[PDB]
Design an enzyme around this catalytic site. Structure first.
Site, PDB file in Angstrom:
ATOM      1  N   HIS A 119       0.852  -1.217   0.000  1.00 15.29           N
ATOM      2  CA  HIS A 119       0.000   0.000   0.000  1.00 15.29           C
ATOM      3  C   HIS A 119       0.886   1.267   0.000  1.00 15.29           C
ATOM      4  CE1 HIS A 119      -1.824  -3.542   1.880  1.00 15.29           C
ATOM      5  NE2 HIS A 119      -2.767  -3.288   0.993  1.00 15.29           N
TER       6      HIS A 119
HETATM    7  S1  FES Z   1       1.782  -0.220   3.293  1.00 15.12           S
HETATM    8 FE1  FES Z   1       0.428  -1.946   3.502  1.00 15.12          FE
HETATM    9  S2  FES Z   1       1.686  -3.506   4.421  1.00 15.12           S
HETATM   10 FE2  FES Z   1       3.082  -1.855   3.987  1.00 15.12          FE
END
Ligand code: FES
Ligand SMILES: CCCCCCCCCCCCCCCCCC(=O)OC[C@H](COP(=O)([O-])OCC(O)COP(=O)([O-])OC[C@@H](COC(=O)CCCCCCCCCCCCCCCCC)OC(=O)CCCCCCCCCCCCCCCCC)OC(=O)CCCCCCCCCCCCCCCCC
Ligand SMILES: CCCCCCCCCCCCCCCCCC(=O)O[C@@H](COC(=O)CCCCCCCCCCCCCCC)COP(=O)(O)OCC[N+](C)(C)C
Ligand SMILES: CCCCCCCCCCCCCCCCCC(=O)O[C@@H](COC(=O)CCCCCCCCCCCCCCC)COP(=O)(O)OCC[N+](C)(C)C
Ligand SMILES: CCCCCCCCCCCCCCCCCC(=O)O[C@@H](COC(=O)CCCCCCCCCCCCCCC)COP(=O)(O)OC[C@H](O)CO
Ligand SMILES: CCCCCCCCCCCCCCCCCC(=O)O[C@@H](COC(=O)CCCCCCCCCCCCCCC)COP(=O)(O)OC[C@H](O)CO
Ligand SMILES: CCCCCCCCCCCCCCCCCC(=O)O[C@@H](COC(=O)CCCCCCCCCCCCCCC)COP(=O)(O)OC[C@H](O)CO
Ligand SMILES: CCCCCCCCCCCCCCCCCC(=O)OC[C@H](COP(=O)(O)O)OC(=O)CCCCCCCCCCCCCCCCC
Ligand code: HEM
Ligand code: HEM
Ligand code: HEM
Ligand SMILES: COC1=C(OC)C(=O)C(C/C=C(\C)CC/C=C(/C)CC/C=C(\C)CC/C=C(\C)CCC=C(C)C)=C(C)C1=O
Ligand SMILES: COC1=C(OC)C(=O)C(C/C=C(\C)CC/C=C(\C)CC/C=C(\C)CC/C=C(/C)CCC=C(C)C)=C(C)C1=O
Lengths: 69, 244, 28, 179, 387, 64, 57
Positions: D145
């Site tokens: 993410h």
């Molecule tokens: S930003 Fe989602 S697990 Fe690292």
């Protein structure tokens, strides 16, 4: 199909009656009723089983004795 | 042939863990484990038992830790890609006397000493059977001969076992000074084996007593409830026209 | 003014049931 | 009334409703206890087993790496990032405002020897493992993410709330670490 | 009446089906405790499904790991011992309850018209239960598991031309091995759901006409709602069953089993005594009473053929054994014979047990041969016993 | 010291005199060979089943 | 029992809370009593009663 019945039923509220004492009321009559009506059935269920078991043990014992020097 | 094929039946011994509120004798478990690791373990595996299993049953955590540290466990591969050795830890299983089943058979005249982790559950009347077998080495009946490499034991099916008699008097020494006669070590090692086969037994029996008592109370309440709901029907007076 | 009392009673019941299933005595 | 199964109380007797409810509550106690026990037995059968819990603690030693690089070492499923930061990297990691940081932390309270950074390489967002030498902060970029970590393993932009976890490390000599 | 407003939520479309099938369903007021075993069997099925779903979270269907995965369930997962003892003895409870259910149906002639379809669906359910329990017993991969799987898959070889190909197709190879275990696992997850569907169909067929009663008479004049009367009666039964099951689980968890299955499967050595679970023993005895492969398999099939043909026999119009002295006596003899067959199945195949097994199998089939004769003859009772 | 099981086995013999005598009679009857097929396994088993039954209730009392 | 009825049975919410409390406290009391019986029946056999506990060389 619905049945057409003519009857009069009187009922008493559950909270106006003793709930449990009727289990141990006229117990000897209950035992007599169970034994007297069901002794033929109990005989027919138990006698073949016990007879066959006893005969099998008797056969096994005699066979074991016959093979002993 | 006829009777030797099945073997001699074992008696019933009054084991201290028998009874609906009876626990294991944990000092006897500890003595039985020392008998195991001093006599049995050279030929029998206990692959289901870890060193952590003994903690809180027969040994303290530091005691079992030192026990495991005494043994050499394989591990790896390392960064260079080789298998190495390390001291044992609490999470390691008990060591295997042989590398595989074929090695065990080769070391025991073709017979495989079975794993003893569940042996008391893996034989009919298991605890009594194991005790009777261990203490039941004696001379064969007249006219019965045993081939070399076998020993007569009437408890074993067929009467000829590849195990030699191992529970000889004072074959172990006990930390509490318990005299290590053959019967004493037999009882202790069977206590240890029975704990190994069923380590949940004490929790199981406590649960059983508690919940059977509670369920009996619930059954009395259920009977009262049913009869309360049915009394209006069972005591009703029914008037009908019909006679015959 | 009985629905509020019913809500309070059922809230007490729900709290009692929560403490009973999870029994968080070692966390409080 | 038929009296074979039940004998009535005398007519006009007070109703037995209160006694009945009191009696029924006793068995209701047991029913609730039984239901609670069975459900909790299923829930806790899913929890970590004893063999799993027996493998939750150990220590491993390590050595040295050239500057400007990072090595991913192992433990029990939590990889550890080790990087030898250059002096320019240390200077770059010491010229940022603490207030702007999502998680307020200083460089010094995260490092023992300023020439090495030892952190656990698991994203604090959802468990993914950040990519080294990636992102727009010279540190770590999480491919899941888009969590961005800097030289000190501190979160700067993204969904992850906390900086990279610092384990317990020490130096027994010039080229020997231990966790 | 015009349903402009909402009355009881029970009569709303959200709940009306459940209300009319489970709360207000008319039930004969004179049902005895022998009528609670259907609900008991349903509860046993749910218990098996719940425990098996949770046990499948920790079981590995591989020959190198299955035994060890069971042992790990017993030793490592918290409450695992309970989950396993509950599934293994719940199979036995399921079979005890269902056997009592079946013999209730036999005693009161619940199979007779108009309930023939109920009985046939029950027979299908019994077959499903047998298959499910057997393939489940294979999963621990003990000695009993391996050798029982060997013989049951071998049963297909009784067919002359294509029997061997069916055996080798069932195995997935030339012997019972990992393929057998893996396919048996999938089947074991699947068959319980088909059992649930079959049980629902069973219940719907039974509610077409309602339950039979101990008197065996038309009961429309004295019916009462299932809730609460038979709910609380079945609750008494559920608590008593819970006490029974708990006694088995906590104090005698291994008495209904054989220690051989605590030995890992050894394809080299067959154990000296090789028997199925106790609930399969009567079928075992009937199988071994025939000194012929095809004859034995055919007798096993003929058992279920007779069970299926029972409701369609032209019979007398009297159901309950309470008014049929001869059929009542024959029922008790059949019960004794079935218990004897179960005991014989546990014995080694040698004298005197071969003769006893043969005679017992003959008696078992004589029950189903004689009942139609009894019906035909007893049709003339009302014309011969005049007031 | 001395193993309690053997001592109990010797002290329990007066309760098992009939199987013991029958086993001794069997041994005497087979002292002749007859191609090495005769044996006294059954009588041996009867005697030791009586002895074990006598010993078992009393052994564990002398053990710790 | 009519006095206890006027405090616990008048509202189903109080009655349900009472049933929950009864389950909790009664199960605890039964557990305690069962453990007392278990301890009284197995004197000397516990792990904590091993004479040499801590004394393995
Ligand atoms: S930003 Fe989602 S697990 Fe690292
Ligand atoms: C399952 C339940 C287990 C008990 C079943 C007993 C049968 C029964 O009572 O009906 C079911 C009964 C009520 O259900 P139901 O819906 O009414 O169904 C009734 C049936 O249709 C049955 O209805 P029924 O009318 O056809 O039969 C009722 C039954 C009768 O049911 C009873 O059992 C009730 C009698 C016992 C209760 C007595 C209570 C004590 C009070 C006595 C009176 C005191 C007077 C006051 C005095 C004050 C001082 C002056 O009659 C029987 O014949 C049953 C067969 C057993 C007979 C053999 C024993 C007879 C007694 C021995 C002969 C007498 C000589 C005694 C000498 C000493 C012997 C030791 O269920 C219960 O009561 C639950 C019992 C809960 C017990 C606790 C848990 C037990 C299990 C623990 C497991 C632990 C491991
Ligand atoms: C803090 C307040 C108390 C909290 C607990 C509340 C619940 C208590 C549980 C009930 C205890 C009292 C049980 C009934 C006592 C009366 C015994 C008796 O005489 O039998 C009754 C029937 O009662 C029963 O059948 C017994 C049912 C008891 C239910 C089992 C109680 C469960 C205890 C729960 C305790 C919590 C531990 C469990 C936690 C999970 C007779 O009924 P009748 O036949 O209609 O009248 C006979 C006429 N004469 C009065 C003159 C005798
Ligand atoms: C192995 C596991 C598999 C299960 C094996 C067990 C199978 C048992 C099946 C039971 C048969 C189910 C059909 C029930 C119908 C029969 C019945 O309920 O009772 C019979 C009769 O029951 C019997 O005859 C049973 C005979 C066998 C009993 C022998 C066992 C001993 C029981 C005594 C209790 C233990 C004493 C031990 C020594 C002290 C009378 O029923 P009705 O015709 O409906 O008449 C009702 C009575 N009344 C007129 C008052 C309305
Ligand atoms: C596989 C296992 C084997 C079988 C196991 C048993 C299966 C379930 C147990 C047996 C059936 C129990 C069904 C219990 C339902 C009782 C409903 C009931 O008592 O209704 C109450 C009401 O509770 C309800 O069900 C209402 C809400 C229903 C929401 C859906 C009381 O209301 P009443 O009859 O006075 O009428 C009032 C009216 O309904 C109110 O609108
Ligand atoms: C009729 C009531 C409702 C239905 C309940 C049915 C109850 C009737 C009995 C049904 C048969 C029970 C099972 C039959 C075989 C069991 C016996 C057996 O197989 O042997 C085991 C032994 O069987 C038992 O131990 C019986 C235990 C019964 C539970 C009794 C404890 C009661 C606890 C609560 C008290 C309840 C009081 C209620 C008062 C209201 C194993 O022995 P072991 O030597 O291997 O192990 C020793 C250890 O003690 C056993 O774990
Ligand atoms: C598993 C299959 C078994 C195969 C068996 C081999 C072939 C035998 C088949 C016959 C069944 C054997 C059992 C039959 C006898 C049952 C016992 C009996 O019926 O005796 C009654 C006594 O009365 C009789 O029924 C005797 C009649 C003898 C037979 C006469 C035949 C003529 C009637 C033909 C009618 C055919 C249809 C009848 C339907 C019921 C019982 O009297 P009671 O219970 O009312 O009261 C007395 C007791 O003391 C208290 O309970
Ligand atoms: C319902 C009947 C269930 C059958 C058992 C009877 C109720 C429970 C008492 C068991 C007694 C027993 O053998 O062990 C207890 C045991 C005697 O067995 P022991 O361990 O061999 O001495 O005695 C006790 O620990 C105290 C008695 C138990 C509590 C009784 C409550 C009523
Ligand atoms: C106190 C120590 C020991 C105990 C408690 C023990 C326990 C057992 C048990 C329970 C069996 C199973 C018997 C059966 O299948 O019914 C067995 C068999 C066997 N044991 Fe051990 N054992 C011990 C020591 C040894 C030793 C030291 C050896 C080898 C030197 C050994 C070799 C064997 C062999 C070969 C078998 C199989 C014999 C056969 O099947 O014929 N055991 N033992
Ligand atoms: C979908 C539901 C079910 C699942 C997921 C399931 C799953 C399992 C699993 C994983 C095992 C292997 C673990 C063990 O041995 O304890 C097993 C064994 C077994 N299952 Fe099931 N099962 C289900 C339903 C049933 C039903 C309905 C029956 C009875 C008809 C049954 C009877 C058995 C038996 C007899 C065993 C062997 C038990 C033993 O000795 O250990 N199962 N099941
Ligand atoms: C999973 C197995 C089964 C379940 C869950 C089940 C369920 C039920 C239920 C709930 C009832 C109504 C209540 C009762 O009479 O007890 C019933 C009735 C009945 N069942 Fe089943 N059953 C099963 C197996 C069988 C089998 C194997 C048979 C026969 C081969 C059978 C034949 C019947 C008959 C004839 C009735 C009607 C009883 C009467 O009206 O007197 N069932 N079943
Ligand atoms: C010593 O000997 C013996 C055993 O041993 C210990 C036994 O246990 C038993 C017990 C077995 C009994 C009572 C019968 C078992 C009956 C059946 C029908 C099981 C056969 C089914 C199997 C193996 C799985 C079904 C496979 C399917 C549906 C394939 C899937 C295919 C598709 C979906 C296309 C007996 C009789 C026995 O004598
Ligand atoms: C007149 O009426 C009634 C009866 O007398 C004929 C009864 O015998 C019973 C009691 C017995 C019943 C209903 C047994 C039902 C048994 C079955 C179907 C076995 C398995 C049970 C399951 C899984 C239920 C399946 C149903 C659904 C909708 C699936 C979803 C449910 C769940 C997730 C649990 C009841 C309640 C009843 O009132």
């Amino acid at each position: 199909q619905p049945v057409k019945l003519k009857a009069v039923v009187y009922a008493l509220s559950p909270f106006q009656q003793k709930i449990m004492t009727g289990l141990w009321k006229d117990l000897p009559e209950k035992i007599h009723h169970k034994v007297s009506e069901n002794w033929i059935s109990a005989t027919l269920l138990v006698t073949p089983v016990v007879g066959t078991y006893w005969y099998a043990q008797y056969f096994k014992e005699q066979e074991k004795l016959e093979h002993r020097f | 042939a006829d009777e030797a094929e099945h073997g001699l039946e074992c008696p019933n011994y009054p084991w201290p863990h028998e009874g609906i509120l009876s626990s294991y004798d944990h000092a006897s478990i500890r003595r039985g484990h020392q008998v195991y690791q001093q006599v049995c373990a050279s030929c029998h595996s206990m692959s289901l038992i870890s060193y952590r299993d003994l903690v809180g049953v027969a040994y303290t955590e530091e005691e079992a830790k030192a026990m495991a540290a005494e043994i050499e466990v394989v591990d790896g591969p390392n960064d260079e890609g080789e298998m190495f050795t390390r001291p044992g830890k609490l999470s390691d299983r008990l060591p295997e006397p042989y590398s595989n089943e074929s090695a065990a058979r080769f070391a025991n005249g073709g017979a495989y000493p079975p794993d003893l982790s569940l042996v008391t559950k893996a034989r009919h009347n298991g605890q009594n059977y194991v005790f009777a077998l261990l203490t039941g080495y004696r001379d064969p009946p007249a006219g019965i001969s045993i081939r070399e490499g076998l020993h007569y034991n009437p408890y074993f099916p067929g009467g000829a076992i590849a195990m030699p008699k191992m529970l000889n008097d004072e074959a172990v020494e006990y930390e509490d000074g318990t005299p290590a006669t053959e019967a004493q070590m037999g009882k202790d090692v069977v206590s240890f084996l029975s704990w190994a086969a069923e380590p949940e037994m004490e929790e199981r029996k406590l649960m059983g007593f508690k919940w059977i008592f509670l369920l009996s109370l619930a059954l009395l309440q259920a009977a009262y409830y049913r009869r309360l709901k049915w009394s209006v029907l069972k005591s009703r007076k029914l008037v009908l026209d019909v006679v015959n | 003014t009985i629905d509020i009392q019913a809500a309070a009673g059922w809230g007490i019941a729900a709290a009692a049931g929560a403490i009973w299933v999870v029994q968080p005595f070692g966390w409080i | 009334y038929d009296d074979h199964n039940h004998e009535r109380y005398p007519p006009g007797d007070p109703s037995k409703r209160a006694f009945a409810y009191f009696v029924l509550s006793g068995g209701r106690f047991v029913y609730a206890s039984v239901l609670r026990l069975l459900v909790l037995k299923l829930i806790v059968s899913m929890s970590a087993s004893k063999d799993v819990l027996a493998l939750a603690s150990l220590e491993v030693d390590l050595g040295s790496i050239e500057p400007g690089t990072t090595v991913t070492v192992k433990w029990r499923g939590k990889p550890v990032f080790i990087r030898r930061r250059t002096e320019d990297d240390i200077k770059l990691a010491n010229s940022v405002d603490v207030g702007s940081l999502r998680d307020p932390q200083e460089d010094s309270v995260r490092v023992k020897n300023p020439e090495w950074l030892v952190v656990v390489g698991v994203c604090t967002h959802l468990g993914c493992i950040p990519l080294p030498n990636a992102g727009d902060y010279g540190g770590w970029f999480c491919p899941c993410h888009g969590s961005h970590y800097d030289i000190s393993g501190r979160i700067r932009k993204g969904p992850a709330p906390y900086n990279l976890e610092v384990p317990t490390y020490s130096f027994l000599e010039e080229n020997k670490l231990l966790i | 009446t015009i349903r402009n407003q909402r009355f009881s939520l029970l009569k709303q479309p959200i709940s009306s089906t459940l209300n009319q099938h489970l709360v207000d369903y008319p039930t004969p007021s004179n049902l005895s405790y022998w009528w609670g075993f259907g609900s008991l069997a349903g509860i046993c099925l749910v218990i098996q499904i719940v425990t098996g779903v949770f046990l499948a979270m920790h079981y590995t269907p591989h020959v190198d790991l299955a035994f060890n995965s069971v042992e790990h369930i017993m030793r490592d997962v918290e409450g695992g011992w309970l989950l396993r003892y509950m599934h293994a003895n719940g199979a036995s409870m399921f079979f005890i309850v269902v056997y009592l259910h079946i013999f209730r149906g036999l005693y009161y002639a619940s199979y007779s018209s108009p309930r023939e379809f109920v009985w046939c669906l029950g027979v299908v359910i019994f077959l499903l239960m047998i298959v499910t329990a057997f393939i489940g017993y294979v999963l621990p991969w003990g000695q009993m598991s391996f050798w029982g799987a060997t013989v049951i898959t071998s049963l297909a070889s009784a067919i002359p031309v294509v029997g061997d190909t069916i055996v080798t197709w069932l195995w997935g190879g030339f012997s019972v091995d990992n393929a057998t275990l893996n396919r048996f696992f999938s089947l074991h997850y699947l068959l319980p759901f088909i059992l649930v569907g079959a049980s629902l169909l069973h219940l719907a067929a039974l509610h077409q006409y309602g339950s039979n009663n101990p008197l065996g008479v038309h009961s429309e004049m004295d019916k009462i709602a299932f809730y609460p009367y038979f709910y609380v009666k079945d609750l008494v039964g559920w608590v008593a069953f819970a006490i029974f099951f708990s006694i088995w689980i906590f104090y005698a968890p291994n008495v209904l089993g054989h220690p051989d299955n605590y030995i890992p499967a050894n394809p080299m050595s067959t154990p000296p005594h090789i028997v199925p679970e106790w609930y399969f023993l009567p079928i075992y005895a009937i199988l071994r009473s025939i000194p012929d492969k095809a004859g034995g398999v055919a007798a096993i099939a003929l058992v279920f053929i007779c069970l299926l043909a029972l409701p369609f026999f032209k019979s007398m119009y009297v159901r309950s054994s309470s008014f049929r002295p001869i059929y009542q006596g024959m029922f008790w003899l059949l019960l004794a014979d079935c218990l004897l067959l179960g005991w014989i199945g546990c014995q080694p195949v040698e004298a005197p047990f071969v003769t006893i097994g043969q005679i017992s199998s003959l008696v078992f089939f004589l029950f189903f041969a004689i009942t139609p004769i009894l019906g035909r003859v007893g049709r003339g009772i009302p014309n011969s016993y005049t007031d | 010291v001395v193993d309690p099981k053997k001592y109990l086995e010797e002290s329990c013999k007066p309760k098992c005199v009939k199987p013991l005598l029958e086993y001794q009679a069997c041994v005497k009857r087979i002292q002749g060979d007859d191609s090495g097929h005769k044996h006294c396994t059954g009588q041996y088993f009867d005697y030791w089943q009586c002895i074990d039954k006598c010993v078992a209730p009393k052994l564990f009392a002398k053990l710790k | 029992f009519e006095g206890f009825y006027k405090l616990i049975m008048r509202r189903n919410s109080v009655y349900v809370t009472f049933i929950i409390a009864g389950a909790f406290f009664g199960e605890r009391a039964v557990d305690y009593g069962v453990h007392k019986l278990w301890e009284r029946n197995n004197v000397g056999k516990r792990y904590e009663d091993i004479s040499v506990l801590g004394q393995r060389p």
